[PDB]
Amino acid sequence: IPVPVDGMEYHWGNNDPVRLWSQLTTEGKPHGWPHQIVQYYYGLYPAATVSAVVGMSLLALISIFASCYMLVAARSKCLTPYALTPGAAVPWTLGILCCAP
Amino acid sequence: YEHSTVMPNVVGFPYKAHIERPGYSPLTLQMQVVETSLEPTLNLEYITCEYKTVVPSPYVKCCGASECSTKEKPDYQCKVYTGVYPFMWGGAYCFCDSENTQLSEAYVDRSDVCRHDHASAYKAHTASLKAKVRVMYGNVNQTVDVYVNGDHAVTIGGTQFIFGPLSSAWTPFDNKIVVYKDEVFNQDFPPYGSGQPGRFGDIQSRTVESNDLYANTALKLARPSPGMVHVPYTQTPSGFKYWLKEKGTALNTKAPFGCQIKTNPVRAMNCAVGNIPVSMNLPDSAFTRIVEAPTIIDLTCTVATCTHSSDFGGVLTLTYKTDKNGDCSVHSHSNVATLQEATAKVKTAGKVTLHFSTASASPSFVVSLCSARATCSASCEPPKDHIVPYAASHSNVVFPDMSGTALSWVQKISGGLGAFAIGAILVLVVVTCIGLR
C-alpha cells in the first residue's frame, strides 16, 4: 500500500487505526557533481526535474547558437567589402582575426 | 498593542509568532491547536427502520357473506373469498357446503424496537469550526475552547484573542446524508412520501414518535388453500435490512485530509485544511523594556549538523558578546526552518545552541536573539529511514536557496553564457558602427 508524504492510515481488526508517514529519502548526492544533484532531485520529483533539465538544456543550446550566428554575421560584414573590390588586398592582420583566405 | 498573524490549521504543529514593538524587547508567542471540530447543521427529513406485518385471525362466516371495509392503516389490504370449507380441527367448522366466506385482512406497522434500531435521513448545511488552542508566552501556559469565526473572543492572562474565520469553505459532508449507529453515508435518499418496495425508505416516518407511517411494501393477499384456516400473502422483504448489507462504504473509511467522522453530534474531527487568522491585543505589562533586557552584539551563526528529516534534525550555534545575564527570545524569519525553542538563556560565555527543522537541501534563514540578527546557511543531507510514525515538524518548503550548491552551478553556467553573449553583442555593434561610417 502506498505511503505518500501526505500520510496513510490502516485499520486492521478491532485494533485502533495506525498512521504512517513518508520521509524525503532518495538516491544521489545533494552536494556533489551535477549529475549526482540531478539524480537526487529526480529521486524526489522525477517529472518536474526532467522538465526543468530539458528546458535549461534547450535554453543553453539556443543561447550558444544565437551567439555563434552573431559572430558569423559580424565576420561576414567586416570581411565582405574586400570580396567586392577588384584589387582585394585584405590586411593580413585582419585576415588572422577573421580567418580570411 | 494590536497584532495579527496567520497560523496553519494542522493539529500538533508548533506555531510561533514574533512581536516587535518599539520601546520593548521582542516577544515570541507560541500557540498550537490540540483538536478541531466541524459540525454541520442538520434538518431531519424522516426516520426509517424495519417494518412489522400485522395479521389478525381470519373471519369465517358459515352460511353467510361479508363485506370489505376500508381502514386508516398503512398499506392496508382486505379481501373476501367466495366459497370455503375450513375444516378447523376434528370437524369441518361449518355445516354449510358452499355458502361460506372468509375475511382476510393485513396491514403494515412499525417495528417494536424502531426507537432503538433506526437510520436518520438528514440535510446538512454550512458547518461551524470549533477548535481548542494552547497559548504559551512568558510564564502563562493555558488551553482554551474557541469558535473559529470572527465572533468568539477569549482572554488568556490579560491578552484578548479572536481566531478568525477559516480560509477554506471545504466540508466532507454532502447535501443529503444518512446516519446509522456510528457511521455516516453520503447518500441520496428518496423523497418523503415516495418510497419504493424493498429498498431504503420503504417505510418512512417524520420522527420517532410521529404517527404518520408512510409504507410501500407491496403487500398482497392470496386465496386460502382449500380445507384449512390460514391467511396467505406475499410481500417484498424489508428495505432497511437490504440496506444493512448493500449500503456501501461509510464516510468514516474514505474522508479527505484525515477527518475522523464522529458520534451523535455529527462532526468531522481534526481535518487539516486552510489557515486560521488570529488577532491579539496584548497588555502593556507582557513586554520587557529594552533597558532591562540584555544587549547582544556581534551575533554570528554556525550550523553544526543538518539532516532534513521530519523531526528537528539540525543544530545551530550562536556566538555573541553580551553585557548581562538574561533571557532572549529566538525566532526564524523564514518558514524554510522551524526552531524548536521560543526563548533562550544568554550568559557571559557567549554560546547558545538551538534545534531546527527543515526539508531543504540548502536552507538559508535569518535567526534573531533579543536585539540581534544573523544569517544561517547550511547543507542538509537526506535521511535514510523511509517511513516514520509522526508528521513533519516543518512546512514542506523544498526549493534550494540561491547560492547553494545546486544553484551556484546554474549561476556560474549562466554567467559564462551571458558573458559570451555580451561579448558577441559588443563585437557586432562595434563592427557595424565602424563600417556604417
Add this chain to the structure above:
Amino acid sequence: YEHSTVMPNVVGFPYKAHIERPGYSPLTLQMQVVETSLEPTLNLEYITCEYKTVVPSPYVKCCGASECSTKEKPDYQCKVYTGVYPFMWGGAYCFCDSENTQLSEAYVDRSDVCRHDHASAYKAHTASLKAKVRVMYGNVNQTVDVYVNGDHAVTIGGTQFIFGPLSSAWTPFDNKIVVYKDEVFNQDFPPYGSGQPGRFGDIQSRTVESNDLYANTALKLARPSPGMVHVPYTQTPSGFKYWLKEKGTALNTKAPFGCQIKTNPVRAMNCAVGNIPVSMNLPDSAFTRIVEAPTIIDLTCTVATCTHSSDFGGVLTLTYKTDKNGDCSVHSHSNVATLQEATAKVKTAGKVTLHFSTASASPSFVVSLCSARATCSASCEPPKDHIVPYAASHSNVVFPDMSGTALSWVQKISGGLGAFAIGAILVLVVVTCIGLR
C-alpha cells in the same frame, strides 16, 4: 398521466390548470395558495438581559487591618480603606481613632427574571418554504400542508402532487438578527466576550440556564464618607434597558412584499414573491372518455360589457351547437384575461356566460369549451373607483392587442408611410434603370 405547470406565489390568487390528454375530454384543475411560511434556521449566539449588582455588608476591623482577595465573580471589585471611624449608631463602633479598615466589595449577577424577559442574538441561514394549498377538481375539495421543495410528495384523492422549489432565494432576514418578545430586528450585535458598557450586550451568557456570565458594566468602587457606614460605588446603567429605548424600528414594521414576521418559531408568513413549479401524476379515473363528452360545434365568443377593474369586470357569452347535455370545462389560453369558473354547463339549445378579469383596454384571448375553440376580442373602459380593499384577480398585462383600437391607428399610419416609401423606392429604381439604357 404526468403533467407539470408553474403557479405564482400569491396567496388567494385563483389558479387554473388545463390538462388535455388524448382520448379523453380536457380537465381543468384549479388550486390556490391559502397560506405561506418561510422559516430560517437559527444558531443562538448568546443571551442578554438586565443585570444586578450585589453589594454585601462592609467589613470593618476595629483596631487592626484587612487585606483583599480576588474572586472569580463577574466584574468583581475589592478595596481596602485605611483610616475610618464609622459611628455605627448610638456610638462609634470602634475604639481606636485612626487604626480601622473597611473592606468594600461588589460584583455583578444576572437578573432574577432573565428567563422571563431577555433578548436572543441569532444567526440566520437558508430558509424553508412551507405552504398550504387547496386543490379542487371533479368532486375533490382538500387542502394539504406541504413542503415547497422538490422532495415532499402528497396524494389528494389518488393524484400525487409535488410542489417544487421556489424560483427565488430572497429572504427578509439578515445574517444577524435579535429577537425580543414578538419582534425581530436586523441588528448587528457585538461578538461574545467583547461587549461594552451601557450598550446592548454589556452582559452576555450563552444560554438562559448557562453559568458563564461575561460582564462589562464599568463597576467602580469609591471611598466612604467620614463617620458613616455605607458602600459607595458608581456604575454605568444597564444596556438592555437602554436598548429597549433606542432599538429602532422592527422588521415587522418594514418588510418587503407584505411579509408578516411572526412569533416564537421565527417565520415570515405570506410574502408574495416567486413562482412554484408543480408536478402531478393523475390516474385514469380522473378523466372522462371523449365519447361521453358532448360534441361542441360552431363556437363563437362575443363580449357584452367589459371594464378592466380589479375584480371580474368582464362578461362574455358563448354560442354553440351541441348534440347532448353535459358539463364541459372552460379555459383561457392567455393570462391577459383570467376566468372565474372552471366547469360550465352545456345545454341542448342555448348559450353559456362566463365572467373574466383583465387589466387591458383591448384584450384578445382564446377560450375553449370541451374541445371546441374560439377567439375573443373586447373593448374595455377604465373603472371609476380609485381605491379598493382587495387585490387584483388578474396578472398586470396591459399591452393591448394588435388590431385593437389603439394599435390599428399605428398600423394604418405606418402602412401609409411604407406605401410612400416603397413608391419612392420604385420610382428611383425605375429612373436609374431607364437611364442605364
